[PDB]
Design a binder for this molecule. Structure first.
Ligand SMILES: OC[C@H]1O[C@@H]2O[C@H]3[C@H](O)[C@@H](O)[C@@H](O[C@H]4[C@H](O)[C@@H](O)[C@@H](O[C@H]5[C@H](O)[C@@H](O)[C@@H](O[C@H]6[C@H](O)[C@@H](O)[C@@H](O[C@H]7[C@H](O)[C@@H](O)[C@@H](O[C@H]8[C@H](O)[C@@H](O)[C@@H](O[C@H]1[C@H](O)[C@H]2O)O[C@@H]8CO)O[C@@H]7CO)O[C@@H]6CO)O[C@@H]5CO)O[C@@H]4CO)O[C@@H]3CO
Length: 474
């Protein structure tokens, strides 16, 4: 429903905006200065109160949904090391902060989804601490995959199953009834609290197929409109048959757009340092083939709900991926709003923040307007409003019309999108292949340009370097 074409904005809680009172236990020490370089353990103190305060900023941009990284009590600044699934982290302001955020968000028609880390917990979680203090005598032993005792929890060789072998992330034993009951109650609780959906962290670490099916029924049961999206970096047919997730994070689409728009100017060395991998340059046709596969291998309702991002807290920032090329970053972001799926933007990309891989990509949000790349932001604001006023952009099919070099043209129902992802101008006179049957006056919704096709060929002026156009029969 609402999650099929919606503009999503991803926020890393500790780095958006610091405001309001903390929750209990309140921190008692200095916070890493806001404008200082992000570190592995540093906390800047952003809160959910602040996120609620910055809603007018998000509304201006056109945001329809907020995807938040983990917000429950954790000892990590990124919060993937959960300590208590039933309490919003004190530093973020506690449950009352999340409650207030949801009220303001919903009052203005904005949805909010949370990040669920259910494969593992931090070492600070109750059950794990219980294991550490009591060893074999602990009645919580079966919450984890204990190899032996002692646990050696602070060595590079933990005596228990852990995410990627990292001792900071003890792997949960989901088959244990007490565990599955806890996790399912968690998934349900927050949906009833007011949350609109869940973004599942590395769901593949929990291969048990019955868990996710139960998860879906419990969540959808508490709110049929809840959105469930999972983190899968490649093909995800298994998780999209309809009995598990509604969609996944479309990293494959991110690789395609980056390769096509990034061209040879893409910093493949930077991208190779993360899950993006070494992104291969792509020409028009090859790029279109990838879209055609991505847009057809899943049911249409799934394709329309796909979380279409370019970057995230797990990738280098866009501007750094384009070696400072503002025009390229602008085109890649722009193009997302012209494809089926949910265009998703990582906080700061709309104003041009730069950075390599984590923690460089998790800097404090810049609120000094005079410092924003206004061109990038206006494009996002412009195309988000375009998508909002032209619903066909989120519902229609994808049909390639022209492909050559870095020149692409595809149709979305009544619209013909023309992409010029190259340094040189592109005259829009290619054959329409039947796109505008009526064969009359047409207008580029983006520039206002107007013209009348003849001979089955488009009639617009040259498309400037790294520019976009969206025609519709006037
Ligand atoms: O010993 C661990 C590891 O240490 C080094 O790697 C570090 C790396 O240099 C840092 O950048 C960072 O990594 C971050 C990464 O860059 C981000 O992208 C993100 O990670 C995401 C993945 O990129 C993404 O693919 C997904 O992960 C899922 C996979 O898609 C899925 O296939 C599967 O993964 C399994 C592998 O297929 C399998 O080969 C095996 O992987 C092992 C490696 O082969 C082995 O070398 C080692 O990895 C080293 C690495 O070489 C060092 O350079 O251990 C691996 C684990 O055994 O097993 C995988 C597990 O199933 O499943 C995963 C889901 O878990 O999502 C992730 C998360 O979004 O975040 C990374 C962390 O910030 O840190 C690492 C570690 O310090």
């Amino acid at each position: 429903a609402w999650y099929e074409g919606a503009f999503f904005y991803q926020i890393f809680p500790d780095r958006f905006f610091r405001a309001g009172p903390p929750g209990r236990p309140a921190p008692a020490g200095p916070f890493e200065p806001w404008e200082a370089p992000p570190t592995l353990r540093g906390f800047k103190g952003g809160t959910l109160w602040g996120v609620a305060e910055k809603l007018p900023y998000l509304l201006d941009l056109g945001v329809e949904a907020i995807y938040l990284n983990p917000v429950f009590a954790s000892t990590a600044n990124h919060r993937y090391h959960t300590v208590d699934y039933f309490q919003v982290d004190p530093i973020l302001g506690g449950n009352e902060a999340l409650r207030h955020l949801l009220e303001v968000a919903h009052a203005h028609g904005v949805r909010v989804i949370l990040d669920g880390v259910f494969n593992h917990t931090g070492r600070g979680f109750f059950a794990f601490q219980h294991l550490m203090e009591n060893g074999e005598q602990s009645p919580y032993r079966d919450w984890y995959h204990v190899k032996g005792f002692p646990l050696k929890a602070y060595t590079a060789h933990p005596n228990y199953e852990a995410w990627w072998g990292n001792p900071e992330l003890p792997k949960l034993k989901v088959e244990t009834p007490a565990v599955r009951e806890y996790l399912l109650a968690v998934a349900e609780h927050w949906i009833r609290f007011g949350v609109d959906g869940w973004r599942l962290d590395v769901p593949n670490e929990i291969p048990d197929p019955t868990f996710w099916r139960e998860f879906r029924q419990r969540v959808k049961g508490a709110n049929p409109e809840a959105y469930i999206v999972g983190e899968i970096w490649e093909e995800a047919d298994f998780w999209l048959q309809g009995d598990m997730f509604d969609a996944v994070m479309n990293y494959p689409l991110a690789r395609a757009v980056l390769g096509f728009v990034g061209g040879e100017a893409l910093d493949r060395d930077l991208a190779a340092q993360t899950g993006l991998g070494r992104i291969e340059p792509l020409q028009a046709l090859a790029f279109s083939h990838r879209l055609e596969d991505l847009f057809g291998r899943y049911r249409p309702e799934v394709v329309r709900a796909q979380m279409n991002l370019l970057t995230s807290h797990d990738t280098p920032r866009l501007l750094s991926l384009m070696r400072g090329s503002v025009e390229r970053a602008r085109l890649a972001l722009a193009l997302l709003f012209l494809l089926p799926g949910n265009p998703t933007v990582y906080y700061g990309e709309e104003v041009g923040m730069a950075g390599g891989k984590d923690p460089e990509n998790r800097g404090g949000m810049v609120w000094e307007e005079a410092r924003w790349q206004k061109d990038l932001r206006e494009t996002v604001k412009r195309l988000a409003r375009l998508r909002k006023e032209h619903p066909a952009l989120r519902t229609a099919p994808y049909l390639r019309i022209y492909a050559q070099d870095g020149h692409l043209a595809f149709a979305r129902g009544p619209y013909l999108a023309v992409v010029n992802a190259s340094p040189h101008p592109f005259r829009q006179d290619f054959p329409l292949h039947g796109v505008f049957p009526r064969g009359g006056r047409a207008v580029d919704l983006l520039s206002g340009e107007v013209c009348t096709p003849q001979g089955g060929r488009l009639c617009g002026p040259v498309l400037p370097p790294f520019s976009l156009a969206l025609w519709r029969e006037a």
